[PDB]
């Protein structure tokens, strides 16, 4: 029974941890600062794995201490232990505490624990039922710190339906709760609900709806970093689909910056894929170092080959990469953006042709770009010249392209503009860092002269004046 | 009691705004007074000054110096003294009365 002994030994400490978290929530209510709730949810993912049927049962039947309809709701949905030898009655509430109903903060937290275990137990329908009851509970209430808990509930409330694969009945609830949070100035709940709505819209390729939603809604500035990352990723995906590549790239870079530094590997992989695709679409080049990471190497290998093909500026290589990894790109939800990369491949090839050749025959250009005919190369090069891709001219009668003589870059305003952007960013960094310096509320003006020691000087100086002058 | 609480909260908000405006003004003028105090502390360096030798830095603001009168003193250092110049065996100018490193 070594396994039983060990399992019970972790079950008791997990029960103690849940007790510590419920005490943190209750003292957050008592002290009226909702931020104490965060450290309860800070350990939430760790506890989500550190619980089982016995832990849930012990917690729900010693934690309520009142057999209301709640205990008639979640007890039947979980298994019960036998007459265990160590019948340690886990009753944190005694006397008036047991009689008094639980705070709305903590019943929701235990119900979240039950929902999480149901998800880990694949009881998606039962999890949906429990989450529906929980949503009624937290929609009825109007507390302030509960919102900090409430957002998390919503993230799981949608998550259970993610395994139900409906995501449509949840849209109305998400919109209603988003409105009720926005009207209440609930920053955390509004951010979580906006992220959930964006994810729901993108699950069905409703990019127009998500674009409208992000156009009219205002994301909370004082939101969590883990919610800022999701919002930036979703907005970047919207911008990428809507051909707004520059803002898409900026948002994806910001999301990668705000991603967790050690965890959330899959989020990193998805954002890296989309960022690589957008950067190739923008005409820039993806950073090589991101392909060197141990976690990202296998995921980005098809994207590494795609980046290689695009950098070579060869139509045939890009088409080979497409015909080789089209199914993988489709499974990753980036095939539509990959298709647009043909124009960028042609643009890059034309750019290197102009950068390398002073005068180059149109047939040679078509051969180097693996196009069909030099007649098509004529139109392609003309479009590139008109768009400003390359500074050149075409001699139709002669049949070649003459690239313009390179102008002295440092004698123009472009270095000034680049330096301007970098200087403004550096000054912004300095101002942000200065504004982030916090002085602890020390007892100021106590490092000054002390009263007794200052009086010492007055008396000694009085003696000095009374004795030296006489 | 709802209206009383709401009106009290409104008055508290307006009072907080007044307090923040006053604090910003006081910072603006306190910078000027800091500059004035820095300027006026330089009267301790008025001549005549004795010449000593910086022997050791006991702490941030006090030091042992050997005056040319022949006596070693544990005195204070003027806060506006560049501590990068307080090398060993460095000649310093001390207040003629208090021997303070000025």
């Amino acid at each position: 029974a070594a396994a039983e002994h060990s399992q019970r030994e972790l079950d008791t400490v997990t029960l103690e941890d849940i007790k510590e978290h419920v005490k943190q929530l209750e003292k957050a209510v008592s002290g009226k600062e909702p931020r104490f709730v965060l450290r309860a949810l800070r350990m939430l993912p760790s506890t989500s794995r550190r619980l089982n049927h016995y832990v849930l049962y012990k917690a729900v039947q010693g934690f309520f201490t009142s057999n209301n309809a709640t205990r008639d709701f979640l007890l039947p949905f979980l298994e019960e232990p036998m007459d265990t030898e160590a019948d340690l009655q886990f009753r944190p509430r005694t006397g008036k505490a047991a009689s008094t109903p639980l705070l709305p903060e903590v019943e929701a937290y235990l119900q979240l624990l039950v929902v999480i275990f149901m998800m880990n137990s694949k009881r998606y329908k039962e999890a949906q039922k429990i989450s529906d009851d929980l949503m009624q509970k937290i929609s009825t209430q109007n507390r302030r710190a509960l919102d900090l808990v409430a957002a998390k509930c919503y993230y799981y409330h949608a998550r259970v339906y993610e395994f139900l694969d409906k995501l449509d009945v949840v849209r109305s609830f998400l919109h209603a709760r988003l409105r009720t949070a926005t009207l209440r100035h609930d920053a955390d709940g509004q951010a979580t609900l906006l992220n959930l709505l964006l994810r729901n819209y993108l699950h069905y390729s409703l990019y127009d709806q998500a674009e409208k939603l992000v156009s009219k809604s205002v994301f909370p500035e004082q939101a969590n970093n883990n919610e800022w990352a999701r919002y930036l990723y979703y907005t970047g995906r919207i911008k990428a689909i809507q051909l707004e590549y520059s803002e898409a790239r900026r948002t994806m870079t910001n999301a990668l910056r705000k991603a967790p530094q050690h965890t959330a590997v899959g989020f990193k992989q998805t954002v890296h894929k989309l960022l690589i695709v957008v950067e190739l679409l923008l005409g820039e080049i993806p950073d090589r170092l991101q392909f060197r990471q141990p976690s990202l190497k296998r995921s980005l290998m098809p994207y590494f080959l795609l980046t290689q093909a695009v950098r070579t500026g060869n139509l045939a290589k890009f088409n080979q990469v497409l015909d080789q990894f089209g199914e993988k790109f489709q499974a990753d939800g980036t095939y539509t953006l990959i298709i647009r990369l043909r124009h960028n491949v042609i643009k890059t090839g034309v750019r290197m042709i102009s950068l390398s050749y002073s005068r180059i025959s149109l047939a040679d250009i078509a051969q180097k770009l693996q196009l069909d005919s030099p007649e098509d190369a004529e139109f392609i090069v003309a479009k590139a010249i008109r768009d400003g891709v390359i500074e050149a001219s075409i001699n139709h009668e002669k049949g070649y392209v003459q690239s313009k003589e390179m102008i002295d870059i440092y004698s123009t305003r472009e270095p000034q503009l680049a330096f301007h952007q970098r200087i403004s960013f550096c000054l912004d960094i300095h101002n942000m860092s200065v504004k982030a310096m916090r002085f602890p509320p020390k007892s100021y003006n106590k490092d000054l002269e002390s009263a007794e020691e200052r009086r010492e000087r007055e008396q000694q100086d009085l003696e000095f004046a009374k004795e030296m002058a006489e | 009691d709802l209206y009383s609480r709401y009106k009290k909260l409104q008055q508290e908000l307006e009072f907080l705004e007044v307090q923040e405006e006053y604090i910003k003004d006081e910072q603006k003028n306190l910078k000027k007074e800091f500059l004035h105090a820095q300027e006026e502390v330089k009267r301790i360096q008025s001549i005549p000054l004795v010449i000593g030798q910086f022997l050791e830095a006991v702490d941030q603001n006090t030091a042992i110096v050997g005056s040319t009168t022949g006596s070693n003193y544990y005195v204070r250092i003027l806060s506006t003294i560049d501590r990068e110049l307080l090398k060993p065996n460095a000649s310093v100018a001390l207040h003629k009365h208090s021997n303070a490193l000025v």
């Binding site: 390729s205 409703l206 990019y207 127009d208 674009e211 689909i241 809507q242 051909l243 089209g326 489709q330 095939y335 539509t336 298709i339 647009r340 043909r342 124009h343 042609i346 007649e375 098509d376 004529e378 139109f379 392609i380 090069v381 003309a382 479009k383 590139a384 010249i385 008109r386 050149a392 001219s393 075409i394 001699n395 139709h396 009668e397 123009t412 305003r413 000034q416 301007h420 200087i423 403004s424 000054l427 912004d428 101002n431 200065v434 | 910078k31």
Partner: protein, 175 residues
């Protein structure tokens, strides 16, 4: 797309969706074109002809393959696709000449016949006077218009002074 769970897959659905995509291309609402294209599954985009034709036309238009854009009229997936094609074509010519002015410094009169996809030489004259192209005595259209450079002759001293003043603000106004 909404009631497709109970509704069966319409035979004409893909054709009409491709018609919508081609119409979006005709009105230069390419941003809406890609958003509506993303609504389709990724398979029929590269497989179904009714969807393959408009997306390929968009690729040709963006990359500059205007000859393929004109050839797209011949191989349309359906007769209903015809009308929107003409709506696109009127743009293409005015786009093609836009390249010719900025790329070709001088082109022969007949040389543009395949470039501008004009059947009758008379159709050149009216389009040229609409475009205001100065025909040359040697049947050469002189497109000397690059003299209107980015105008580096002028220093944007006002903008530069504003930027430097903003630097001074960010260095001093912080307090």
């Amino acid at each position: 797309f909404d009631y497709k769970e109970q509704l069966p897959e319409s035979a004409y659905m893909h054709q009409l969706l491709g018609l919508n995509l081609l119409f979006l291309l005709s009105q230069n609402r390419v941003a809406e074109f890609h958003t509506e294209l993303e609504r389709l599954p990724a398979k029929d985009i590269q497989t179904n002809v009714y969807i393959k034709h408009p997306v390929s036309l968009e690729q040709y238009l963006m990359e500059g393959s205007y000859n393929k854009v004109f050839l797209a009229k011949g191989n349309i997936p359906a007769e209903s696709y015809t009308f929107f094609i003409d709506i696109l074509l009127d743009t293409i010519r005015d786009e093609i000449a836009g390249c010719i002015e900025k790329a070709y410094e001088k082109i022969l009169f007949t040389e543009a016949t395949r470039i501008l996809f004009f059947n009758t030489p008379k159709k050149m004259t009216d389009y040229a006077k609409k475009r205001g192209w100065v025909l040359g005595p040697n049947n050469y259209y002189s497109f000397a218009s690059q003299q209107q450079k980015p105008e580096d002759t002028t220093i944007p001293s006002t903008e530069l002074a504003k930027q430097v003043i903003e630097y001074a603000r960010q260095l001093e106004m912080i307090v």
